[PDB]
Write a protein that binds this ligand. Sequence first.
Ligand code: 1UN
Lengths: 99, 99
Amino acid sequence: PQITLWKRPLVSIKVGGQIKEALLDTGADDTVIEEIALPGRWKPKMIGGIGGFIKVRQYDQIIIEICGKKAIGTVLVGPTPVNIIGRNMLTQLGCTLNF
Amino acid sequence: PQITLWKRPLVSIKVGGQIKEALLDTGADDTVIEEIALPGRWKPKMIGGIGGFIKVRQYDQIIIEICGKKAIGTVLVGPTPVNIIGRNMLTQLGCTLNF
Ligand SMILES: Cc1c(O)cccc1C(=O)N[C@@H](CSc1ccccc1)[C@H](O)CN1C[C@H]2CCCC[C@H]2C[C@H]1C(=O)NC(C)(C)C
């Protein structure tokens, strides 16, 4: 489909067995989610937002349902205000910006 | 045009009589540019995100240009690591998200 930007592009997602609200974010390289339990070993990571950097746990090959679709990739977990679907996941969905 | 997200969706914009590079951000409610001279009076504003909050100057009635298309609205000026074109401007350009 086509999503307009008159309001925040919020969608429902399923990650780590839970349903959540997330933001389709072309301004994010990564997909980051509030504290949640994911399987496997993680790696440390720094991501720089508008107010500076923070540390998050990096899990790889994590499954996520988004827009009746599935994306399997890197998911960062940390103290984020909003759950974010970054470009690494958006590209798996075949998202493009059009204007 | 149609922009893919394999890499950051950076584009050239014409703002404040200046040509700058900025990121088309569907996750940003607002548009914020690094230090730049703009006409009119401003009001202080705090915007937050990953990493915390920063202080910015809010200018209204600012015109910007991206790929031959123009839009007018509010532009925030402050210490941002990357220039962000938010939804307040993306809508005016007829920018949508497709998949
Ligand atoms: C989450 C993330 C990554 O994993 C990797 C790179 C950047 C980001 C990141 O924070 N990107 C942001 C743009 S600010 C930005 C900073 C550096 C580079 C590019 C953009 C988000 O797209 C938008 N971001 C989405 C969201 C992040 C959690 C807090 C609530 C909003 C805040 C909003 C935001 O920051 N809005 C402003 C108006 C202050 C610009």
